[PDB]
């Protein structure tokens, strides 16, 4: 009856409930190569045999997606939907604030999401047909702003286009102390635009049935 | 006029229709969905699990005809794919390759009795359980449920009737 | 029901994810290459982390 | 007792070309094998099906004279000769059995002798089983035992794997039906050997034969008797009344110094056998390209094989040592005519060549650098690209290495565009001196 078996799924029937998809950049990537040398602490002075090696390392504004079916993570428990709300509050909070590990000894690229929407719909999507288009920089803005407003822009499209039909979608974008709306008026692009990651995580949950 | 065909739309980032010549390590999308493999997302929109399936529900939905019409025909992605054993028991780690489509979109007609096209287009409305492209992965981008039936013909004029 | 979450992330000079080689694995869409961390190594960092298990 | 003869019950599975598949027997399948088709999953277990089915074919035409004709169901005198040796295709019988030996005392799992199901040792991922639990219908049983001579790894203690070592490319010519299929590859010798599944161990002198080639059994084998249950087998998953759990297998070594060319082998220069270098990992001198339909296309092509004899079908199974890698198998449409042997040696070396393309580094830096990596990842699509005209190719009947290099030029623009995104000027003859990379033809 672990979290860690019902929600993520079987250690290495037990039908899971994340929807883990590939993160896909915003824009052109941009591989850079690194020269290193592997220096010698004792100097010597001689025989040299050129140390000359190669590390690539990238930067990136990463698009992620995440599903949870609550009928799935409901039957797993049996019947503790209160633990369900906890299992998803916890996962709420762990994947805004969970990096890989992969060569953090060397590079140390502990950022930050610059804006989580929640959504509750009948259908599955993904928005990934908004960046088809790479995101270029401007003057007056940098790329967090950019693939914002450009995710703002599809949401509108898709809310013009794919909405009514007796199922009205609900969001919850949130951004750290407000610094990036998503997108200016048309309904704020959806319901309450707060800035605190607990915010949201209360929210979802008195959401979903009214929870603690 | 009581609708025949359905229409289905499948297309995202990435997706991946494997076939039999992925054995042992290498997994490899063919070309295309294929009956198989709509027909397992079919069963995870009405709910039917892996058992109780293949006595009831496969052979009267294996009674189809479907066609797929293919636009952006993808480039074949291969991802290193490593399981680790472990963290029987061993420090070993497995190592395969998995192959993905990229940038792919097919369009897939099924056609049959009126009734079945019927419950399949409602309960594609609202599925019972998570719809994916041939891996958990790889979710769609577009709505499955974006084309409306009809009482076509065969299913060259069934793929015919999208923009 | 069904709870769908999207994140946008802008993240430092880093190799988070590697090939067989040791490049940043990447992948193509719309006309481009693009950076791409995996599916399976965003649910093991997940998993298996002190914030799921606390 | 327990009765189960090869022609009385049902273990092959074809299907019509009405559309109708279908589990039949062996009278049925060759009294309409010009009606039907073998249809199995792993392209090993057909070819090693349509072997053994060549086999029989020869044994009895050396027991009958009657050579067969196209379009015929099968000639006369076929059936009821099968007919009257039927109890020589025993299994689980009392004294005679066939593809079998004696009962070592050795007891091992019945999943060692299918090598995508996993056995003791190793891992299990892909396959969720366990051994003595899961078990084997009345048809897996005989797949697995027909898939003895020609696909028997090295394996660890006991190196010696079969006569042909290290399994090869298995090359032979289509067609689309089964009577129609033996047609192309009816090749009787001067000598037809020998019977190896006949009862007799038949210690042979250094020359062996076709039928003493063709059906050489490894190690020595016995199945125990069928439990009763309803659970399904492991391999094709059916539910079924009777299983098979368990085996006796001992290695035994093959003589060495034998004198046996394999009618469907290919070999590099010295009768070495060539097996399909396709790894997972991308290391030094490998460059992961897949489809290695290009390497045999030189030794199949210089020995008595130059005709066309409608479309050829190559099997390739790639392993390690012990451990297998993969399985694969290629159509191509051979209707050309000959070809200068220089353009096809050096078709014949493109692993070399995308490795000494993917090997160059960006700027120049040498040493031991893994050069691009980005380039290793666009050559997958392109040579799934270049394979659909693979007919073309291999004659140069309308396609050649230049023109096959101007697939790489839609792609690698885009992977310049990434490499070299500054909007300078240097940045664009960076761009322009990186996209004219092609590969370069060695020997
Ligand atoms: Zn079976």
């Known amino acids: 009856l672990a979290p860690d078996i019902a929600l993520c799924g079987r250690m290495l029937t037990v039908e899971a409930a994340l929807q883990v998809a590939h993160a896909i950049s915003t824009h052109i990537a941009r591989p850079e190569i690194d020269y290193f040398v592997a220096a010698d602490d004792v100097p010597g002075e001689d025989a040299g045999a050129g140390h000359i090696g190669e590390s690539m390392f990238a930067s990136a504004c990463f698009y992620k997606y995440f599903s949870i079916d609550w009928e799935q993570l409901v039957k797993n428990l049996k019947g503790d939907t209160n633990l369900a709300a906890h299992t998803v509050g916890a996962f709420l909070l762990a994947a805004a604030k969970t990096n890989p590990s992969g060569k953090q000894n060397s590079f140390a690229a502990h950022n930050y999401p610059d804006g989580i929407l929640v959504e509750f719909k009948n259908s599955p999507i993904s928005y990934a047909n908004a960046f088809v288009r790479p995101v270029s920089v401007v003057k007056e803005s940098d790329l967090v702003e950019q693939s914002i407003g450009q995710l703002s822009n599809y949401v509108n499209d898709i809310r013009l286009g794919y909405y009514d039909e007796q199922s009205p979608v609900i969001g919850f974008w949130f951004s750290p102390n407000n610094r990036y709306p998503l997108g200016y008026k048309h309904s704020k692009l959806a319901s309450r635009n707060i800035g605190n990651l607990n915010e949201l995580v209360g929210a979802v949950l008195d959401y979903i049935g009214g929870f603690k | 006029a009581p609708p025949n065909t359905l229409f289905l739309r499948l297309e995202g980032a990435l997706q991946s229709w494997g076939s039999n010549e992925a054995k042992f390590a290498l997994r490899r999308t063919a070309d295309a969905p294929t009956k198989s493999g709509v027909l397992g997302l079919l069963c995870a929109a009405m709910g039917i699990g892996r058992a109780e399936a293949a006595d009831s529900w496969l052979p009267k939905l294996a009674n189809l005809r479907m066609g797929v019409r293919i636009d952006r025909p993808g480039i074949r992605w291969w991802d290193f794919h490593t399981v680790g054993a472990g963290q029987k028991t061993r420090a070993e780690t497995l190592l395969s390759r998995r192959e993905y489509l990229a940038d792919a979109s097919f369009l897939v007609a099924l056609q049959g009795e009126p009734e079945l096209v019927a419950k399949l287009s409602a309960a594609l409305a609202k599925p019972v359980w998570a719809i994916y492209l041939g891996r958990k992965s790889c979710p769609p981008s577009r709505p499955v449920c974006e084309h409306p039936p009809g009482f076509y013909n065969t299913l060259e004029e069934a793929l015919s009737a999208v923009p | ?54 | 007792h327990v009765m189960y003869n090869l022609l009385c019950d049902n273990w092959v599975n074809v299907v019509y070309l009405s559309g109708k598949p279908d589990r039949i027997s062996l009278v049925q399948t060759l009294k309409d094998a010009h009606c039907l088709q073998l249809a199995y999953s792993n392209p090993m277990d057909r070819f090693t099906v349509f072997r053994f089915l060549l086999a029989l074919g020869y044994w009895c035409f050396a027991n009958t004279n009657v050579e067969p004709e196209p379009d015929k169901p099968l000639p006369v005198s076929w059936i009821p000769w099968l007919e009257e040796n039927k109890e020589y295709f025993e299994l689980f019988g009392d004294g005679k059995r066939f593809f079998q030996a004696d009962p070592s005392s050795r007891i091992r799992a019945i999943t060692d002798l299918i090598h995508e199901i996993p056995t003791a040792h190793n891992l299990c991922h892909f396959k969720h089983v366990t051994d003595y639990i899961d078990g084997l219908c009345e048809a897996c049983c005989i797949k697995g035992l027909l898939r003895l001579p020609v696909f028997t790894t090295v394996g660890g203690r006991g190196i010696g794997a079969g006569i042909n070592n290290t399994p090869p490319f298995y090359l032979l010519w289509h067609a689309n039906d089964l009577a129609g299929m033996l047609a192309q590859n009816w090749q009787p010798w001067d000598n037809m050997g020998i019977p190896a599944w006949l009862g007799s161990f038949q210690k042979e002198s250094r020359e062996v034969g076709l039928l003493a080639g063709m059906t050489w059994l490894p190690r020595k084998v016995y199945l125990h008797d069928p439990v009763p249950g309803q659970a399904a087998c492991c391999s094709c998953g059916l539910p079924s009344e009777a299983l098979v759990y368990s085996c006796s297998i001992e290695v035994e070594p093959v003589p060495k110094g034998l004198e046996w060319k394999d009618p469907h082998g290919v070999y590099t220069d010295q009768g070495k056998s060539l097996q399909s270098k396709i790894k997972l990992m991308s290391n030094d001198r490998y460059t992961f390209a897949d489809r290695d339909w290009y390497s045999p296309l030189f030794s199949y092509l210089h020995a008595e094989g130059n005709s066309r004899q409608g479309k050829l079908w190559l099997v390739g199974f790639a392993s390690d040592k012990a451990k297998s890698i993969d399985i694969w198998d290629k159509i191509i449409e051979l209707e050309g005519t000959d070809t200068n042997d220089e353009l096809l040696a050096q078709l014949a070396n493109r692993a070399t060549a995308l490795n000494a393309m993917r090997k160059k580094p960006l700027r120049g830096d040498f040493k031991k650098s893994v050069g691009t990596p980005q380039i290793a990842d666009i050559i997958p699509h392109a040579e799934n690209r270049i394979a659909i005209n693979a007919g073309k190719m291999t004659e140069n009947r309308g396609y050649s290495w230049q023109d096959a290099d101007t697939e790489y030029g839609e792609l690698l623009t885009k992977v310049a565009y990434s490499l070299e995104p500054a909007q300078t000027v240097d940045a664009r003859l960076k761009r322009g001196n990186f996209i004219s990379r092609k590969p370069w033809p060695i020997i």
């Open chain 3, 1 to 54: 029901m069904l709870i769908e979450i999207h994140m946008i992330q802008n993240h430092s000079p880093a190799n988070l994810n590697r090939d067989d080689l040791g490049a940043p694995k990447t992948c193509y869409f719309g006309g481009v290459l693009r950076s791409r961390i995996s599916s399976q190594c965003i649910k093991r960092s997940i998993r298996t982390s002190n914030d799921f298990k606390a």
